[PDB]
């Protein structure tokens, strides 16, 4: 029976434990004999599985932590809306979106930092923003700072509601483990209620607010002259002017005469010629169809009324001759381990973020986002980074599950056991494929560099020489170009003009034009494959060898996160799943850096640009990608050296902050190498000398100073490495794109 | 059902799988020269080298430095011969280093057996490279990869 | 002595088992009695079912054998596990429970090997044991 | 005068001032009069002019680059450039160190020194913060009374 | 025929024939879209094979319906082949496992 | 036979023959009982 | 093989013996410590060098020391 059961007043709200750091942990509650205690407090703050053996306690803590996170996110959103309402040039941008640069942040004039308040436009000077909030609001139909103030108020109220809910559901009414372990009910409610009703409500909002307001805005009406959303809601005649099918009502809906709504529910495709974004009348239909799909999908599982599926039955029924027992035990694993669920959900969320980055650039969804090149680049790279981090976290928590919550008794001759029983084949084959891809993807660049340096330019892998044409990608592009009318008969235009078609231009500037793939694109795609495969190798190898290996037969006893197992067996450094995550994070950084560089150069060289009166488009770099992106020297000179000019010549401008952050990110990246190339013994001995100096003056801390643990040194090195690298790319990208757009 | 212990030994570092222990796999492996029964190490080497020096001429012929020249095929054959000599040297040094002079009766895991294998491999490889050179030089379809029919 | 007829814990196979080095150099074995049919974790990877009675298992390394023994002793309550080492000649030797009692508890008969008659601070210097046969002890 | 020219009478300094003011005025020309941007840019111009005038009158020396240079050798004519500023530093830093050391000893003679070092006894900490204003005489008094320097035989050291 | 060390496998070609027909007969369903012409998937594939055999050495140019028709038809055919072998060997007349 | 031929006569030697022979002999020496 | 040595500082806690993944350390009789037992290293040829014994040692400076020496198959922990 799916039912609600809670414990009343399980934990008393009191500050007694606020003054007892480490209370959650038995080893830490004693006190800080050394400085390692301080670091352990933070490393084990949110490891609820190591505080108690009670799954109920862990689940309640997780529920309340989620409520706190939602309150933080709502506060973030309310802050963004309030800054848009008070410290922005949103009205001027609405008046002339193609001339004034969006800005919603202003700095104080203290030490000359007021230079960062650049001339964005609209009589306003602030910090140009690249998050796309202006376009989000324009699509939502917001035309005033009053509406943004009300948005901020709603965000603040929801943040308060979420924090109250977290406190209430930890200290007043904490649900029980039987409540938590309702996968069928939770999936039904999420799918139908959360997703389906969310997209249904958004479709209603688009049909009643966004569509007419944006129709008038594209018609050129002034934001002040556009009527209000409640006017549209209550005046069916006013709406029936813009969309003449509202005079028909909901009778077509309930009689299945849905064609009557083709005026505002259509499958046009392409991009709005005025704004350069997707048709909001297409987005409304998209969200309505998604609502139907999700509400139907949320009726699949059994809750209380017999109708539905049991995922245990499905999984146990899915087995074959190559898999023995198949998916047996997985339902229990997933309703008894939060780490397995976290790994699955993180992998899916990161992959979704990557998919979102690709689609949101090729099919600009918001009005006036496509010609806002800083926004496009920033969003693409941002979501790429989020996806990479989520994937690495998925690997980490898969390893944590394998070490902590994996029980061989419950997993016998199922898929998990069989994977562990042939892990050597998997890793050896992935090793071979990684080496093959590395060779035949990077040695090609090396071959080209050597041939261009030797003057044998006819021996290179180039479009003007030996060719490596991505015929399959070009074939798919041709399919998608010709689909309108043939394989998608009732669509007027292609899904994206990147596959092919006519240039979409807004404000004498390209919004989206065909993206042509050649030898350089073939090369960079195979390098992307290489990097993804190597990252997968590192992460999967760590996960599979988390518990045991030929080297360390008892590794689950050492744990998921241990430094080593000593200098024996030749040396057993970094042999833990945690260290696999550490190296795989390095490699994820490599992969995403190459991906975002590919995006930046390709889009600045073959998509983005200004279109002349001759209908010809001149790009930001002008075709340098086809003949330069085939050599590492080409990348070093025509991309890094060439495009770093904007950020290195930003002093004295409003991008001087980008220049300074460029240098500081370089500093942090280099500073990471001190932790990464070094070990703990040297720093402990240096601390011994420094402590002698302190003792010579008859004083020294009661908390004995210690060098960072081996794992913590690796973690600090990795964190500084990632911060420095990503910050360098951040400053470089933003300075370049805000200078040339 | 399909995946089982190797040789009914659950603790050997192997699994019996369709790719590893199917009837087609076993027949193919047992009929390859490296495993066929009755062949001398010399005949094994002969067949293997014949097969290898043939494919070697093409990559060199069609992608080598002198591929757009009138001496592309001869250059290719020559470069195959050089690589064959290098690999024969590798085989010889491997034989002298790995196998000691005890006599196991030419089982391909003996000094004499490996010497015969490397000699046969050299002869067969050079012969196969020459055969491929002759066929390419004399047949247009091979010089154009079929772009004579266009 | 070791009886090579003891059944094995009905393992389903793995790629973590012993390799040619086991047939050429050394192959370790472990024998233990179990009161029922439980599921244990192989030191090489995967799950196995131990039989009711005596169980014999082959591994490539003494550390693998001793990790399996520790698992049996702690997870389960089996402490009659004996470890042997087998050479290609058929020279099966006996290693664990070397004297029939585990090393963690003192037993009469053992002789101290590698014991030194001072603290580590009394070790000689390499300069003092250089160009000589003296030991830093 | 030492090896450079006074900054109050340097064409390079005047040119730098002119360039800064002209940049600000060019930025201002595109904003309506009385609007917040115009007022902000005007205030920036005023601040630049005041800074340059004050630097000129300060007696700072300026090189061929047109930027003030500091003579940190001990010359009393340029004490305000390094020495007096550095004396203020040394005062503040000795204050910080003296009060921190005092608190370390206070926590040392406590029931739970580690608890006192992670969760502080801020009344006593503020007491020490106050004491820190005569740290030079206090520190020398500690030194001469022998409570500062520990003996060689009472400090742990590694073996040779 | 042994699919593994000692596991036997029938490898009946009538399974292949039945799966081919199961995917191809539905493929006859015509469509007036340009890709198919007026005809179905299987008939369009046959027509393209003949048309590009008339011009033998020259491959069907990129953008020709041949590639898309080939890919879709073979995707469906392989799916039906997998399902048919599953049905014949697991749900068939001599299977042992209750699937 | 002039000195101008010496580069073409020697560079292949020093760069392919000397390394090959050295590597083979060193291989035989290092792996030898 | 690695050279494992024990000194007079042994207190007979036996944790060095219990921490060894191999069986290299065993308890023998002694009169220099209250427990009456001292660690000894008879099977030093099985030592891998993990220093788990060193980690599980409570005496100021370790009573058990592992000096890593020549490497063999067993020392390198090579299952192949
Ligand atoms: C420093 C020494 C050195 C020398 C002298 C050469 C010489 C040569 N290299 Mg280069 N090469 C070197 C180092 C050197 N390489 C290194 C370190 C690398 C690794 C990056 C390469 C990688 C490399 C590649 C990838 C290629 C070359 C090629 C060539 C050829 C030049 C182009 C041409 O038209 O010839 C080609 C025309 C020919 C007729 C080739 C005839 C070669 C004969 C058969 C050589 C005799 C070999 C000999 C019998 C072996 C003895 C083995 C013994 C030492 C154990 C030429 C044979 C090209 C080539 O075609 O090589 C076959 C080529 O594709 N080299
Ligand atoms: C959660 C996200 C978030 C973030 C990152 C920021 C960031 C900022 N806000 Mg804040 N702000 C937020 C939410 C957020 N706000 C919300 C939810 C509200 C609504 C109440 C506001 C209302 C608000 C106002 C009214 C002002 C700012 C200002 C600022 C800026 C200076 C703040 C400062 O120096 O305080 C330092 C304060 C300390 C005590 C230290 C800074 C860019 C100021 C600004 O932009 O001035 C030009 C400003 O005046 N914010
Ligand atoms: C949860 C979303 C939602 C909500 C709250 C409403 C609310 C309303 N709709 Mg509905 N409407 C929605 C989604 C929604 N609609 C969707 C997805 C469609 C597309 C099928 C429509 C199509 C639609 C039409 C065609 C009409 C309404 C109308 C109305 C009003 C009377 C009922 C009311 C304001 C009527 C009205 O007065 O519109 C202004 C009306 O004529 N709606
Ligand atoms: C849904 C997201 C999610 C959730 C709920 C968790 C939850 C958990 N993770 Mg994490 N994890 C995630 C994502 C997530 N992870 C991702 C994306 C990754 C990949 C990087 C990881 C990788 C990972 C590892 C490798 C480990 C965990 C561990 C844990 C557990 C304890 C973490 C802890 O105590 O943090 C407390 C919080 C901190 C220590 C703060 C860390 C923040 C660092 C210092 C960087 C912050 C920089 C910040 C952005 C500012 C930069 C700007 C600069 C100018 C200041 C906990 C169950 C640990 C575990 O289970 O061990 C047994 C563990 O070892 N996670
Ligand atoms: C690297 C070497 C070096 C060092 C260590 C110093 C040190 C000093 N120089 Mg400098 N000087 C140097 C090189 C150096 N100089 C060089 C190369 C030049 C030529 C370019 C000069 C030119 C120079 C000048 C022109 C003068 C100094 C002066 C001084 C003294 C300033 C403080 C003082 O008078 O305290 C005196 C105060 C006390 C003893 C106690 C004060 C007590 C209360 C708190 C007040 C100081 C001792 C000044 C001075 O008078 O030096 C004697 C000074 O007028 N120096
Ligand atoms: C705005 C300018 C500025 C800034 C941001 C800093 C920042 C810093 N200075 Mg300072 N410094 C400045 C100007 C500045 N300085 C100037 C103008 C001078 C010249 C007088 C100095 C001279 C100076 C010295 C001599 C030292 C620093 C140190 C430091 C660092 C640590 C200070 C500390 O921990 O204090 C908190 C206080 C303590 C921890 C107590 C002990 C240390 C202080 C400095 C002792 C003061 C009294 C003592 C009797 C002085 C003897 C000096 C003699 C041996 C030369 C810190 C990064 C310290 C450093 O880098 O150490 C590695 C350091 O020793 N600075
Ligand atoms: C694509 C073609 C196709 C499809 C979809 C199915 C579907 C089905 N067959 Mg199979 N079958 C096929 C071709 C196909 N068959 C062919 C060509 C043959 C002849 C060789 C057979 C012979 C056969 C037999 C003898 C039996 C089945 C059975 C079944 C049912 C359960 C087993 C199964 O395969 O689950 C299919 C998977 C799903 C339904 C899940 C949908 C997942 C999608 C892809 C997402 C199921 C309705 C058994 C049954 O229950 O009979 C009614 C049964 O007894 N089939
Ligand atoms: C610009 C304004 C600056 C000019 C103003 C001048 C006034 C400075 C006052 C300094 C002061 O009061 O020191 C107070 C300190 C107290 O120190 C304390 O003395 C304590 C013992 S006792 O106070 O001496 O009894 C001792 O235990 C403690 O550690 C120590 O810190 O007095 C002394 O210890 C010695 C004073 C030095 C006497 C010579 C000064 C001549 C002038
Ligand atoms: C997806 C591609 C699938 C490849 C065929 C694989 C296939 O579909 O097999 C599917 C096959 C079906 O298994 P059963 O019918 O026993 O299981 C049905 C399951 O639903 C129950 O677990 O499972 C295996 O044999 C797994 C073997 C993985 C094979 C490992 C090699 C492939 C590694 C990945 C590299 C692929 C590159 C391909 C290019
Ligand atoms: C695995 C797979 C999947 C899809 C289908 C596909 C067919 C591609 C299949 C793969 C097939 C492959 C890899 C085929 C490759 C074939 C090869 C390399 C064949 C080689 C043949 C070699 C031949 C004749 C050699 C002939 C040599 C001769 C006379 C030599 C004669 C001589 C000798 C030996 C010595 C003295 C001189 C003299 C007399 C000239
Ligand atoms: C430098 C270094 C040290 C010495 C560094 C230490 C002990 C760090 C202590 C730094 C102080 C205590 C942090 C506070 C001061 C910082 C300036 C503030 C930023 C830190 C907070 C945000 C946490 C190690 O101990 C170490 C250990 C293992 C591998 C590599 C290394 C290593 O590289
Ligand atoms: S741990 Fe150190 S002290 Fe305790 S027994 Fe083993 S050796 Fe002797």
Numbering used by the authors:
A (entry chain A): 12 to 752
B (entry chain L): 3 to 152
C (entry chain D): 4 to 140
D (entry chain F): 24 to 183
E (entry chain O): 56 to 154
F (entry chain I): 1 to 33
G (entry chain C): 2 to 81
Show me the paper's own sentences about this structure.
Here, we report the cryogenic electron microscopy (cryo-EM) structure of PSI–ACPI, an 885-kDa membrane-spanning photosynthetic protein supercomplex, from the cryptophyte Chroomonas placoidea at 2.7-Å resolution. The cryptophyte PSI core consists of 14 subunits (PsaA–F, PsaI–M, PsaO, PsaR) and the subunit Unk1, which is not present in other previously characterized PSI complexes. A pigment-binding subunit that is not present in any other previously characterized PSI–LHCI complexes, ACPI-S, mediates the association and energy transfer between the outer and inner ACPIs.
The structure reveals that PSI–ACPI comprises 14 ACPI subunits that form 2 antenna layers surrounding a PSI core containing a total of 373 pigments. ACPI-S separates the 14 ACPIs into 2 layers: an inner antenna layer around the PSI core comprising ACPI-1 to ACPI-11; and an outer antenna layer comprising ACPI-12 to ACPI-14. We also identified 254 Chl a, 20 Chl c, 59 alloxanthin (Alx), 25 α-carotene (α-Car), 12 crocoxanthin (Cro), 3 monadoxanthin (Mon), and 2 phylloquinone molecules, 3 Fe4S4 clusters, 5 detergent molecules, as well as 34 lipids including 23 phosphatidyl glycerol (PG), 7 monogalactosyldiacyl glycerol, 2 digalactosyldiacyl glycerol, and 2 sulfoquinovosyldiacyl glycerol molecules. Since the cryo-EM densities of the ACPI-10 and ACPI-13 subunits are identical, we used the same sequence from the transcriptome to build their models. EET between ACPI-10 and the PSI core is facilitated by the coupling of ACPI-10/Chl a311 and PsaO/Chl a202. ACPI-9/10/11 possess unique EET pathways to the PSI core mediated by PsaK and PsaO.
